[PDB]
PDB file of C-alpha atoms and ligand atoms in Angstrom:
ATOM      1  CA  UNK A   1       0.000   0.000   0.000  1.00 28.44           C
ATOM      2  CA  UNK A   2       1.109   3.470  -0.850  1.00 24.12           C
ATOM      3  CA  UNK A   3      -1.215   4.332   2.117  1.00 23.10           C
ATOM      4  CA  UNK A   4       0.865   2.052   4.272  1.00 23.92           C
ATOM      5  CA  UNK A   5       3.942   3.806   2.971  1.00 21.54           C
ATOM      6  CA  UNK A   6       2.510   7.171   3.958  1.00 21.41           C
ATOM      7  CA  UNK A   7       1.695   5.893   7.448  1.00 28.37           C
ATOM      8  CA  UNK A   8       5.191   4.536   7.768  1.00 28.92           C
ATOM      9  CA  UNK A   9       6.458   7.916   6.664  1.00 30.49           C
ATOM     10  CA  UNK A  10       4.235   9.681   9.184  1.00 32.28           C
ATOM     11  CA  UNK A  11       5.518   7.330  11.839  1.00 30.89           C
ATOM     12  CA  UNK A  12       9.129   8.429  11.383  1.00 30.30           C
ATOM     13  CA  UNK A  13       8.572  12.051  10.464  1.00 29.44           C
ATOM     14  CA  UNK A  14       9.202  13.119  14.020  1.00 30.46           C
ATOM     15  CA  UNK A  15      12.782  11.896  13.980  1.00 28.23           C
ATOM     16  CA  UNK A  16      13.670  13.002  10.482  1.00 28.67           C
ATOM     17  CA  UNK A  17      12.583  16.647  10.564  1.00 28.06           C
ATOM     18  CA  UNK A  18      13.183  19.750  12.637  1.00 25.66           C
ATOM     19  CA  UNK A  19      10.461  22.330  12.442  1.00 25.49           C
ATOM     20  CA  UNK A  20       8.408  25.193  13.850  1.00 23.99           C
ATOM     21  CA  UNK A  21       4.736  25.796  13.339  1.00 25.22           C
ATOM     22  CA  UNK A  22       1.407  27.011  14.617  1.00 28.72           C
ATOM     23  CA  UNK A  23      -1.782  25.061  14.710  1.00 35.18           C
ATOM     24  CA  UNK A  24      -5.386  25.228  15.692  1.00 32.41           C
ATOM     25  CA  UNK A  25      -7.332  22.716  17.718  1.00 31.83           C
ATOM     26  CA  UNK A  26     -11.073  22.982  17.542  1.00 29.09           C
ATOM     27  CA  UNK A  27     -13.980  21.025  18.933  1.00 28.73           C
ATOM     28  CA  UNK A  28     -17.479  21.851  20.037  1.00 27.99           C
ATOM     29  CA  UNK A  29     -16.998  24.445  22.682  1.00 28.12           C
ATOM     30  CA  UNK A  30     -13.342  25.100  22.202  1.00 26.85           C
ATOM     31  CA  UNK A  31     -11.126  26.930  19.792  1.00 28.55           C
ATOM     32  CA  UNK A  32      -7.459  27.280  20.573  1.00 28.27           C
ATOM     33  CA  UNK A  33      -4.180  28.052  18.852  1.00 28.79           C
ATOM     34  CA  UNK A  34      -0.754  26.603  19.617  1.00 26.90           C
ATOM     35  CA  UNK A  35       2.901  26.834  18.679  1.00 26.66           C
ATOM     36  CA  UNK A  36       5.304  23.951  18.321  1.00 28.82           C
ATOM     37  CA  UNK A  37       9.120  23.932  18.131  1.00 26.22           C
ATOM     38  CA  UNK A  38      10.646  20.547  17.308  1.00 28.53           C
ATOM     39  CA  UNK A  39      14.343  19.829  16.942  1.00 26.49           C
ATOM     40  CA  UNK A  40      16.047  16.629  16.088  1.00 25.97           C
ATOM     41  CA  UNK A  41      19.362  16.644  17.952  1.00 25.49           C
ATOM     42  CA  UNK A  42      22.701  15.402  16.540  1.00 29.82           C
ATOM     43  CA  UNK A  43      22.216  12.062  18.279  1.00 27.80           C
ATOM     44  CA  UNK A  44      18.682  11.719  16.913  1.00 29.05           C
ATOM     45  CA  UNK A  45      16.911  12.611  20.154  1.00 25.15           C
ATOM     46  CA  UNK A  46      13.803  14.772  19.719  1.00 27.43           C
ATOM     47  CA  UNK A  47      13.426  17.937  21.799  1.00 26.16           C
ATOM     48  CA  UNK A  48      10.032  19.517  21.571  1.00 24.07           C
ATOM     49  CA  UNK A  49       8.153  22.436  23.106  1.00 20.58           C
ATOM     50  CA  UNK A  50       4.407  23.065  22.777  1.00 18.78           C
ATOM     51  CA  UNK A  51       2.854  26.365  23.799  1.00 21.71           C
ATOM     52  CA  UNK A  52      -0.741  27.551  23.913  1.00 18.51           C
ATOM     53  CA  UNK A  53      -0.975  30.901  22.241  1.00 15.25           C
ATOM     54  CA  UNK A  54      -4.405  32.149  23.248  1.00 15.57           C
ATOM     55  CA  UNK A  55      -5.583  32.557  26.761  1.00 12.50           C
ATOM     56  CA  UNK A  56      -3.441  30.998  29.428  1.00 13.77           C
ATOM     57  CA  UNK A  57       0.107  30.086  28.770  1.00 11.45           C
ATOM     58  CA  UNK A  58      -0.104  26.298  28.888  1.00 11.86           C
ATOM     59  CA  UNK A  59       3.069  24.559  27.915  1.00 11.94           C
ATOM     60  CA  UNK A  60       4.940  21.270  27.746  1.00 10.15           C
ATOM     61  CA  UNK A  61       8.510  20.397  26.940  1.00  9.97           C
ATOM     62  CA  UNK A  62       9.523  16.869  26.005  1.00 10.58           C
ATOM     63  CA  UNK A  63      13.011  15.413  25.439  1.00  9.49           C
ATOM     64  CA  UNK A  64      13.038  12.212  23.560  1.00  9.14           C
ATOM     65  CA  UNK A  65       9.620  11.245  24.709  1.00 11.60           C
ATOM     66  CA  UNK A  66       9.893  12.240  28.332  1.00  8.65           C
ATOM     67  CA  UNK A  67       8.085  15.200  29.778  1.00  6.71           C
ATOM     68  CA  UNK A  68      10.662  17.667  31.064  1.00  5.97           C
ATOM     69  CA  UNK A  69       8.164  20.233  32.234  1.00  6.26           C
ATOM     70  CA  UNK A  70       4.452  20.787  32.073  1.00  5.58           C
ATOM     71  CA  UNK A  71       2.057  23.548  33.055  1.00  6.91           C
ATOM     72  CA  UNK A  72      -0.202  22.942  36.080  1.00  7.14           C
ATOM     73  CA  UNK A  73      -3.383  23.029  34.122  1.00 10.11           C
ATOM     74  CA  UNK A  74      -2.273  20.137  31.992  1.00 11.31           C
ATOM     75  CA  UNK A  75      -1.269  17.868  34.789  1.00 12.83           C
ATOM     76  CA  UNK A  76      -3.525  18.338  37.812  1.00 11.70           C
ATOM     77  CA  UNK A  77      -4.790  14.785  37.454  1.00 12.37           C
ATOM     78  CA  UNK A  78      -1.479  13.058  36.954  1.00  9.18           C
ATOM     79  CA  UNK A  79       0.588  11.469  39.685  1.00  7.35           C
ATOM     80  CA  UNK A  80       4.350  11.520  38.960  1.00 10.55           C
ATOM     81  CA  UNK A  81       4.096   7.742  38.465  1.00 11.44           C
ATOM     82  CA  UNK A  82       1.821   8.448  35.533  1.00  8.46           C
ATOM     83  CA  UNK A  83       4.649  10.357  33.840  1.00  5.46           C
ATOM     84  CA  UNK A  84       5.725   7.277  31.939  1.00  7.92           C
ATOM     85  CA  UNK A  85       5.250   7.194  28.230  1.00  7.16           C
ATOM     86  CA  UNK A  86       3.611   3.871  27.797  1.00  8.79           C
ATOM     87  CA  UNK A  87       4.606   3.580  24.142  1.00  4.22           C
ATOM     88  CA  UNK A  88       5.964   4.647  20.778  1.00  3.86           C
ATOM     89  CA  UNK A  89       3.430   5.082  17.902  1.00  5.30           C
ATOM     90  CA  UNK A  90       3.420   1.915  15.946  1.00  4.28           C
ATOM     91  CA  UNK A  91       1.420   1.797  12.720  1.00  4.01           C
ATOM     92  CA  UNK A  92       2.287  -1.686  11.702  1.00  2.00           C
ATOM     93  CA  UNK A  93      -0.678  -3.374  13.178  1.00  2.00           C
ATOM     94  CA  UNK A  94      -3.113  -0.520  12.633  1.00  2.00           C
ATOM     95  CA  UNK A  95      -4.161  -2.029   9.317  1.00  2.00           C
ATOM     96  CA  UNK A  96      -5.842  -4.845  11.215  1.00  2.00           C
ATOM     97  CA  UNK A  97      -8.385  -2.404  12.738  1.00  2.00           C
ATOM     98  CA  UNK A  98      -8.563   0.357  10.167  1.00  2.00           C
ATOM     99  CA  UNK A  99      -8.704   0.489   6.431  1.00  2.00           C
ATOM    100  CA  UNK A 100      -5.990   2.798   5.134  1.00  2.00           C
ATOM    101  CA  UNK A 101      -6.513   4.537   1.880  1.00  2.00           C
ATOM    102  CA  UNK A 102      -5.165   7.501  -0.084  1.00  2.00           C
ATOM    103  CA  UNK A 103      -8.182   9.446  -1.244  1.00  2.00           C
ATOM    104  CA  UNK A 104      -6.814  12.588  -2.836  1.00  2.00           C
ATOM    105  CA  UNK A 105      -4.577  15.560  -2.594  1.00  2.00           C
ATOM    106  CA  UNK A 106      -4.917  18.821  -0.797  1.00  2.00           C
ATOM    107  CA  UNK A 107      -3.224  22.015   0.107  1.00  2.00           C
ATOM    108  CA  UNK A 108      -2.858  22.861   3.816  1.00  2.00           C
ATOM    109  CA  UNK A 109      -0.844  25.663   5.365  1.00  2.00           C
ATOM    110  CA  UNK A 110       0.316  26.565   1.901  1.00  2.00           C
ATOM    111  CA  UNK A 111       1.808  23.093   1.332  1.00  2.00           C
ATOM    112  CA  UNK A 112       0.761  20.175  -0.937  1.00  2.00           C
ATOM    113  CA  UNK A 113      -0.501  17.216   0.901  1.00  2.00           C
ATOM    114  CA  UNK A 114      -1.935  13.796   0.284  1.00  2.00           C
ATOM    115  CA  UNK A 115      -5.193  12.850   1.963  1.00  2.00           C
ATOM    116  CA  UNK A 116      -5.257   9.574   3.825  1.00  2.00           C
ATOM    117  CA  UNK A 117      -8.531   8.105   5.000  1.00  2.00           C
ATOM    118  CA  UNK A 118      -8.301   6.009   8.109  1.00  2.00           C
ATOM    119  CA  UNK A 119     -11.602   4.188   8.192  1.00  2.00           C
ATOM    120  CA  UNK A 120     -12.685   1.943  11.011  1.00  2.00           C
ATOM    121  CA  UNK A 121     -13.183  -1.711  10.094  1.00  2.00           C
ATOM    122  CA  UNK A 122     -15.995  -1.806  12.630  1.00  2.00           C
ATOM    123  CA  UNK A 123     -18.346   0.286  14.660  1.00  2.00           C
ATOM    124  CA  UNK A 124     -16.191   0.411  17.782  1.00  2.00           C
ATOM    125  CA  UNK A 125     -13.919   3.264  16.937  1.00  2.00           C
ATOM    126  CA  UNK A 126     -13.666   6.565  15.092  1.00  2.00           C
ATOM    127  CA  UNK A 127     -12.116   7.325  11.727  1.00  2.00           C
ATOM    128  CA  UNK A 128      -9.643   9.996  10.735  1.00  2.00           C
ATOM    129  CA  UNK A 129      -9.020  12.086   7.599  1.00  2.00           C
ATOM    130  CA  UNK A 130      -5.334  12.830   7.645  1.00  2.00           C
ATOM    131  CA  UNK A 131      -3.623  15.343   5.389  1.00  2.00           C
ATOM    132  CA  UNK A 132       0.067  14.484   5.234  1.00  2.00           C
ATOM    133  CA  UNK A 133       2.724  16.907   4.114  1.00  2.00           C
ATOM    134  CA  UNK A 134       4.255  15.781   0.868  1.00  2.00           C
ATOM    135  CA  UNK A 135       7.711  17.027   1.727  1.00  2.00           C
ATOM    136  CA  UNK A 136       8.004  15.583   5.201  1.00  2.00           C
ATOM    137  CA  UNK A 137       5.085  13.271   5.968  1.00  2.00           C
ATOM    138  CA  UNK A 138       3.994  15.415   8.940  1.00  2.00           C
ATOM    139  CA  UNK A 139       0.290  15.686   9.637  1.00  2.00           C
ATOM    140  CA  UNK A 140      -0.927  19.092   8.381  1.00  2.00           C
ATOM    141  CA  UNK A 141      -4.544  18.425   9.183  1.00  2.00           C
ATOM    142  CA  UNK A 142      -6.361  15.782  11.217  1.00  2.13           C
ATOM    143  CA  UNK A 143     -10.148  15.435  11.302  1.00  2.00           C
ATOM    144  CA  UNK A 144     -11.845  12.994  13.632  1.00  2.00           C
ATOM    145  CA  UNK A 145     -15.108  11.778  12.212  1.00  2.00           C
ATOM    146  CA  UNK A 146     -17.954   9.932  13.809  1.00  2.00           C
ATOM    147  CA  UNK A 147     -20.078   7.182  12.311  1.00  2.00           C
ATOM    148  CA  UNK A 148     -22.232   9.564  10.460  1.00  2.00           C
ATOM    149  CA  UNK A 149     -19.180  11.251   9.042  1.00  2.00           C
ATOM    150  CA  UNK A 150     -19.740  14.232  11.319  1.00  2.00           C
ATOM    151  CA  UNK A 151     -16.711  16.253  12.494  1.00  2.00           C
ATOM    152  CA  UNK A 152     -15.762  15.730  16.133  1.00  2.00           C
ATOM    153  CA  UNK A 153     -12.517  17.659  16.116  1.00  2.00           C
ATOM    154  CA  UNK A 154     -10.171  19.608  13.921  1.00  2.00           C
ATOM    155  CA  UNK A 155      -6.418  19.755  14.271  1.00  2.00           C
ATOM    156  CA  UNK A 156      -4.801  21.917  11.595  1.00  2.00           C
ATOM    157  CA  UNK A 157      -1.492  23.685  11.034  1.00  2.00           C
ATOM    158  CA  UNK A 158      -1.786  27.218   9.834  1.00  2.00           C
ATOM    159  CA  UNK A 159       1.938  27.748   9.394  1.00  2.00           C
ATOM    160  CA  UNK A 160       4.792  25.255   9.179  1.00  2.00           C
ATOM    161  CA  UNK A 161       8.487  26.013   8.680  1.00  2.00           C
ATOM    162  CA  UNK A 162      10.334  22.789   7.965  1.00  2.00           C
ATOM    163  CA  UNK A 163      13.955  21.836   7.602  1.00  2.00           C
ATOM    164  CA  UNK A 164      14.818  24.800   9.761  1.00  2.00           C
ATOM    165  CA  UNK A 165      15.872  23.973  13.269  1.00  2.00           C
ATOM    166  CA  UNK A 166      14.490  26.029  16.022  1.00  2.00           C
ATOM    167  CA  UNK A 167      17.010  27.937  18.031  1.00  2.00           C
ATOM    168  CA  UNK A 168      17.804  26.946  21.585  1.00  2.00           C
ATOM    169  CA  UNK A 169      15.960  30.006  22.981  1.00  2.00           C
ATOM    170  CA  UNK A 170      12.768  28.782  21.438  1.00  2.00           C
ATOM    171  CA  UNK A 171      13.043  25.373  23.045  1.00  2.00           C
ATOM    172  CA  UNK A 172      13.143  26.846  26.502  1.00  2.00           C
ATOM    173  CA  UNK A 173      10.078  26.970  28.642  1.00  2.00           C
ATOM    174  CA  UNK A 174       8.474  29.735  30.565  1.00  2.00           C
ATOM    175  CA  UNK A 175       8.149  29.675  34.352  1.00  2.00           C
ATOM    176  CA  UNK A 176       4.604  28.395  34.054  1.00  2.00           C
ATOM    177  CA  UNK A 177       6.023  25.073  32.856  1.00  2.00           C
ATOM    178  CA  UNK A 178       6.643  23.037  35.992  1.00  2.00           C
ATOM    179  CA  UNK A 179       9.698  20.862  36.146  1.00  2.00           C
ATOM    180  CA  UNK A 180       8.666  17.245  36.667  1.00  2.00           C
ATOM    181  CA  UNK A 190      -1.722  -4.375  39.365  1.00  2.00           C
ATOM    182  CA  UNK A 191      -5.384  -3.939  39.963  1.00  2.00           C
ATOM    183  CA  UNK A 192      -7.919  -6.667  40.718  1.00  2.00           C
ATOM    184  CA  UNK A 193     -10.173  -5.801  37.813  1.00  2.00           C
ATOM    185  CA  UNK A 194     -10.371  -6.740  34.199  1.00  2.00           C
ATOM    186  CA  UNK A 195     -12.634  -6.313  31.212  1.00  2.00           C
ATOM    187  CA  UNK A 196     -14.378  -9.333  29.853  1.00  2.00           C
ATOM    188  CA  UNK A 197     -14.915  -7.497  26.541  1.00  2.00           C
ATOM    189  CA  UNK A 198     -12.760  -5.275  24.462  1.00  2.00           C
ATOM    190  CA  UNK A 199     -13.273  -4.228  20.815  1.00  2.00           C
ATOM    191  CA  UNK A 200     -10.771  -5.931  18.498  1.00  2.00           C
ATOM    192  CA  UNK A 201      -7.292  -4.580  18.746  1.00  2.00           C
ATOM    193  CA  UNK A 202      -7.636  -2.796  22.037  1.00  2.00           C
ATOM    194  CA  UNK A 203      -5.076  -3.838  24.574  1.00  2.00           C
ATOM    195  CA  UNK A 204      -4.303  -2.920  28.179  1.00  2.00           C
ATOM    196  CA  UNK A 205      -1.677  -0.180  28.291  1.00  2.00           C
ATOM    197  CA  UNK A 206      -1.700   0.802  32.004  1.00  2.00           C
ATOM    198  CA  UNK A 207      -3.059  -0.398  35.262  1.00  2.00           C
ATOM    199  CA  UNK A 208      -2.903   1.487  38.550  1.00  2.00           C
ATOM    200  CA  UNK A 209      -4.699   2.652  41.659  1.00  2.00           C
ATOM    201  CA  UNK A 210      -5.695   6.131  42.555  1.00  2.00           C
ATOM    202  CA  UNK A 211      -7.707   7.592  45.390  1.00  2.00           C
ATOM    203  CA  UNK A 212     -11.271   8.669  44.901  1.00  2.00           C
ATOM    204  CA  UNK A 213     -11.493  12.461  44.498  1.00  2.00           C
ATOM    205  CA  UNK A 214     -14.044  12.610  47.275  1.00  2.00           C
ATOM    206  CA  UNK A 215     -13.676   9.715  49.690  1.00  2.00           C
ATOM    207  CA  UNK A 216     -10.813   7.692  51.133  1.00  2.00           C
ATOM    208  CA  UNK A 217     -11.580   4.864  48.718  1.00  2.00           C
ATOM    209  CA  UNK A 218      -9.134   3.378  46.236  1.00  2.00           C
ATOM    210  CA  UNK A 219     -10.198   3.642  42.663  1.00  2.00           C
ATOM    211  CA  UNK A 220      -8.901   1.205  40.072  1.00  2.00           C
ATOM    212  CA  UNK A 221      -7.687   2.665  36.773  1.00  2.00           C
ATOM    213  CA  UNK A 222      -7.210   0.743  33.543  1.00  2.00           C
ATOM    214  CA  UNK A 223      -6.169   2.204  30.198  1.00  2.00           C
ATOM    215  CA  UNK A 224      -6.620   0.632  26.819  1.00  2.00           C
ATOM    216  CA  UNK A 225      -5.517   1.460  23.317  1.00  2.00           C
ATOM    217  CA  UNK A 226      -5.686   0.162  19.746  1.00  4.87           C
ATOM    218  CA  UNK A 227      -2.790   2.227  18.391  1.00  4.40           C
ATOM    219  CA  UNK A 228      -4.872   5.213  17.635  1.00  5.78           C
ATOM    220  CA  UNK A 229      -7.714   5.444  20.047  1.00  7.15           C
ATOM    221  CA  UNK A 230      -7.667   5.210  23.797  1.00  6.11           C
ATOM    222  CA  UNK A 231     -10.110   4.725  26.615  1.00  3.38           C
ATOM    223  CA  UNK A 232      -9.697   4.658  30.365  1.00  5.77           C
ATOM    224  CA  UNK A 233     -11.715   2.744  32.925  1.00  4.57           C
ATOM    225  CA  UNK A 234     -12.329   3.718  36.513  1.00  5.31           C
ATOM    226  CA  UNK A 235     -13.857   1.428  39.148  1.00  4.35           C
ATOM    227  CA  UNK A 236     -15.038   3.053  42.345  1.00  5.26           C
ATOM    228  CA  UNK A 237     -16.775   1.403  45.334  1.00  3.60           C
ATOM    229  CA  UNK A 238     -20.348   2.418  46.001  1.00  4.22           C
ATOM    230  CA  UNK A 239     -20.552   1.269  49.636  1.00  6.14           C
ATOM    231  CA  UNK A 240     -24.136   0.291  48.982  1.00  7.38           C
ATOM    232  CA  UNK A 241     -25.202   3.622  47.494  1.00  9.77           C
ATOM    233  CA  UNK A 242     -27.863   3.425  44.897  1.00 10.12           C
ATOM    234  CA  UNK A 243     -26.382   5.637  42.274  1.00  7.20           C
ATOM    235  CA  UNK A 244     -27.553   5.410  38.748  1.00  6.14           C
ATOM    236  CA  UNK A 245     -25.862   5.772  35.418  1.00  3.63           C
ATOM    237  CA  UNK A 246     -24.370   8.839  33.883  1.00  5.21           C
ATOM    238  CA  UNK A 247     -23.216  10.108  30.578  1.00  5.08           C
ATOM    239  CA  UNK A 248     -21.320  13.049  29.149  1.00  6.44           C
ATOM    240  CA  UNK A 249     -19.381  14.115  26.111  1.00  4.52           C
ATOM    241  CA  UNK A 250     -16.720  16.726  25.515  1.00  6.93           C
ATOM    242  CA  UNK A 251     -15.882  16.977  21.812  1.00  6.76           C
ATOM    243  CA  UNK A 252     -14.543  13.578  20.698  1.00  8.74           C
ATOM    244  CA  UNK A 253     -14.390  12.290  24.275  1.00  7.25           C
ATOM    245  CA  UNK A 254     -17.257  10.295  25.676  1.00  9.04           C
ATOM    246  CA  UNK A 255     -17.932   9.541  29.320  1.00  6.04           C
ATOM    247  CA  UNK A 256     -20.203   6.747  30.505  1.00  4.95           C
ATOM    248  CA  UNK A 257     -20.770   5.523  34.048  1.00  4.86           C
ATOM    249  CA  UNK A 258     -22.603   2.304  34.864  1.00  3.29           C
ATOM    250  CA  UNK A 259     -23.404   0.646  38.180  1.00  2.00           C
ATOM    251  CA  UNK A 260     -21.965  -2.849  38.548  1.00  2.00           C
ATOM    252  CA  UNK A 261     -23.729  -5.120  41.082  1.00  2.00           C
ATOM    253  CA  UNK A 262     -21.172  -6.899  43.178  1.00  2.00           C
ATOM    254  CA  UNK A 263     -20.859  -8.846  46.408  1.00  2.00           C
ATOM    255  CA  UNK A 264     -18.918  -5.978  47.973  1.00  2.00           C
ATOM    256  CA  UNK A 265     -21.546  -3.236  47.882  1.00  2.00           C
ATOM    257  CA  UNK A 266     -21.639  -2.410  44.207  1.00  2.00           C
ATOM    258  CA  UNK A 267     -19.120  -0.503  42.093  1.00  2.00           C
ATOM    259  CA  UNK A 268     -19.407   2.441  39.695  1.00  2.00           C
ATOM    260  CA  UNK A 269     -17.601   1.769  36.456  1.00  2.00           C
ATOM    261  CA  UNK A 270     -16.702   4.848  34.368  1.00  2.00           C
ATOM    262  CA  UNK A 271     -15.304   4.652  30.874  1.00  2.00           C
ATOM    263  CA  UNK A 272     -13.753   7.719  29.229  1.00  2.00           C
ATOM    264  CA  UNK A 273     -12.352   7.907  25.783  1.00  2.00           C
ATOM    265  CA  UNK A 274     -12.261   8.923  22.207  1.00  2.00           C
ATOM    266  CA  UNK A 275     -14.532   6.100  21.119  1.00  2.00           C
ATOM    267  CA  UNK A 276     -18.217   5.824  20.235  1.00  2.00           C
ATOM    268  CA  UNK A 277     -20.724   5.890  23.079  1.00  2.00           C
ATOM    269  CA  UNK A 278     -21.752   2.350  22.440  1.00  2.00           C
ATOM    270  CA  UNK A 279     -18.245   1.076  22.828  1.00  2.00           C
ATOM    271  CA  UNK A 280     -17.745   2.826  26.079  1.00  2.00           C
ATOM    272  CA  UNK A 281     -21.049   1.540  27.317  1.00  2.00           C
ATOM    273  CA  UNK A 282     -20.335  -2.064  26.338  1.00  2.00           C
ATOM    274  CA  UNK A 283     -16.918  -1.892  28.015  1.00  2.00           C
ATOM    275  CA  UNK A 284     -18.394  -0.426  31.197  1.00  2.00           C
ATOM    276  CA  UNK A 285     -20.883  -3.275  31.408  1.00  2.00           C
ATOM    277  CA  UNK A 286     -18.110  -5.803  30.904  1.00  2.00           C
ATOM    278  CA  UNK A 287     -15.742  -4.883  33.733  1.00  2.00           C
ATOM    279  CA  UNK A 288     -15.425  -7.650  36.308  1.00  2.00           C
ATOM    280  CA  UNK A 289     -13.454  -8.239  39.489  1.00  2.00           C
ATOM    281  CA  UNK A 290     -10.608 -10.736  39.517  1.00  2.00           C
ATOM    282  CA  UNK A 291     -11.484 -14.004  41.281  1.00  2.00           C
ATOM    283  CA  UNK A 292      -9.769 -16.164  43.851  1.00  2.00           C
TER     284      UNK A 292
ATOM    285  CA  UNK B  40     -18.427  18.717  32.028  1.00  2.00           C
ATOM    286  CA  UNK B  41     -22.199  18.643  31.872  1.00  2.00           C
ATOM    287  CA  UNK B  42     -23.107  15.517  33.650  1.00  2.00           C
ATOM    288  CA  UNK B  43     -26.235  13.910  32.386  1.00  2.00           C
ATOM    289  CA  UNK B  44     -28.675  11.294  33.825  1.00  2.00           C
ATOM    290  CA  UNK B  45     -31.937  11.399  35.845  1.00  2.00           C
ATOM    291  CA  UNK B  46     -34.248  10.171  38.677  1.00  2.00           C
ATOM    292  CA  UNK B  47     -33.009   6.900  40.234  1.00  2.00           C
ATOM    293  CA  UNK B  48     -31.182   7.752  43.642  1.00  2.00           C
ATOM    294  CA  UNK B  49     -28.035   8.499  41.754  1.00  2.00           C
ATOM    295  CA  UNK B  50     -27.521  12.103  41.979  1.00  2.00           C
ATOM    296  CA  UNK B  51     -25.806  14.049  39.391  1.00  2.00           C
ATOM    297  CA  UNK B  52     -24.232  15.412  42.548  1.00  2.00           C
ATOM    298  CA  UNK B  53     -22.466  12.181  43.196  1.00  2.00           C
ATOM    299  CA  UNK B  54     -21.379  12.116  39.551  1.00  2.00           C
ATOM    300  CA  UNK B  55     -20.487  15.780  39.455  1.00  2.00           C
ATOM    301  CA  UNK B  56     -17.741  15.361  41.943  1.00  2.00           C
ATOM    302  CA  UNK B  57     -16.181  12.518  40.017  1.00  2.00           C
ATOM    303  CA  UNK B  58     -16.793  12.509  36.322  1.00  2.00           C
ATOM    304  CA  UNK B  59     -15.030  15.749  35.481  1.00  2.00           C
ATOM    305  CA  UNK B  60     -11.968  14.571  37.332  1.00  2.00           C
ATOM    306  CA  UNK B  61     -11.857  11.221  35.651  1.00  2.00           C
ATOM    307  CA  UNK B  62     -12.299  12.940  32.285  1.00  2.00           C
ATOM    308  CA  UNK B  63      -9.371  15.188  33.028  1.00  2.00           C
ATOM    309  CA  UNK B  64      -7.267  12.307  34.076  1.00  2.00           C
ATOM    310  CA  UNK B  65      -7.826  10.369  30.898  1.00  2.00           C
ATOM    311  CA  UNK B  66      -7.116  13.330  28.660  1.00  2.00           C
ATOM    312  CA  UNK B  67      -4.031  14.505  30.559  1.00  2.00           C
ATOM    313  CA  UNK B  68      -2.620  10.996  30.732  1.00  2.00           C
ATOM    314  CA  UNK B  69      -3.018  10.597  27.005  1.00  2.00           C
ATOM    315  CA  UNK B  70      -1.100  13.801  26.659  1.00  2.00           C
ATOM    316  CA  UNK B  71       1.942  12.492  28.480  1.00  2.00           C
ATOM    317  CA  UNK B  72       1.789   8.939  27.125  1.00  2.00           C
ATOM    318  CA  UNK B  73       4.926   9.375  24.956  1.00  3.96           C
ATOM    319  CA  UNK B  74       3.186   9.674  21.618  1.00  3.06           C
ATOM    320  CA  UNK B  75       4.862  11.761  19.023  1.00  6.67           C
ATOM    321  CA  UNK B  76       1.549  13.499  18.330  1.00  6.36           C
ATOM    322  CA  UNK B  77       0.597  16.973  19.320  1.00  7.12           C
ATOM    323  CA  UNK B  78      -3.054  16.061  19.270  1.00 10.03           C
ATOM    324  CA  UNK B  79      -3.370  14.532  22.782  1.00 11.55           C
ATOM    325  CA  UNK B  80      -1.622  17.677  24.106  1.00 10.03           C
ATOM    326  CA  UNK B  81      -4.145  19.789  22.237  1.00 10.26           C
ATOM    327  CA  UNK B  82      -7.083  17.955  23.732  1.00  9.72           C
ATOM    328  CA  UNK B  83      -5.708  18.354  27.255  1.00 12.27           C
ATOM    329  CA  UNK B  84      -5.041  22.042  26.621  1.00 12.63           C
ATOM    330  CA  UNK B  85      -8.648  22.469  25.500  1.00 15.25           C
ATOM    331  CA  UNK B  86      -9.862  21.661  29.011  1.00 15.09           C
TER     332      UNK B  86
HETATM  333 CA1   CA C   1       8.000   8.187  15.613  1.00 15.91          CA
END
């Protein structure tokens, strides 16, 4: 597949190009602009800085995958333990779950691009329309589409200066950038989703431990939270923020019930099915 | 954000104190997962 070739190209673009650019991220209820400085060092390590341009000065700096510093607003819900990068993007197996196809050509940020359709092979995940830079393979535009082909989010570069390496001054963060197994399993996952992390956190409101499980298929992710109910009769809940769905379902158990919450960039049905499928580990 | 469900001894209030936090956690975590993409960062920043 030439589409496969493009994905492979996209996969390594990060280590083969140094660049600066500005992009927009838009979803229902949010419009924001950001700057990125990305330098490939002489040893091949990637140093990258991301800065929000409108409103508050949110920022992150990463050095060869590790977060060097991150603004408070981006990390209030992360323990330092959580600072691990679980993985490297691997597109090799993505073809199992998505159909990859070149569907045309486009012009984005003043640059010629090829348009790659990433279409789900099932109903359990969302598709993407990716516009890849011809010169470098970097993603100029990314549209997340629902089942009906409706737009859930837009990620798009407005300006991209490639080849050129950002100066050291530009890679430096502002002061706002702060220097930095569970007894539950799912008895159902959509094809290709696999457990990426497992840990315990404390409930935000009570002294109770809350089990956290994260799953991914290479492109999409969802997280599961299991919280004790202590016999409370709490019903279900649902929410959505742009591409991210939230579903909470009561699970009857022999230990007073549990509330199972699933959050992720997957269809509502998927989250719901997963929530209903969470079970405690047995003796 | 806007928590939604109704009338079965399961207050939105109970959910209100939890759901937004869990949502934040998932998005933020995705942001720091090591992916080369700027997109997870963008999503987290949008919060
Ligand atoms: Ca890569």
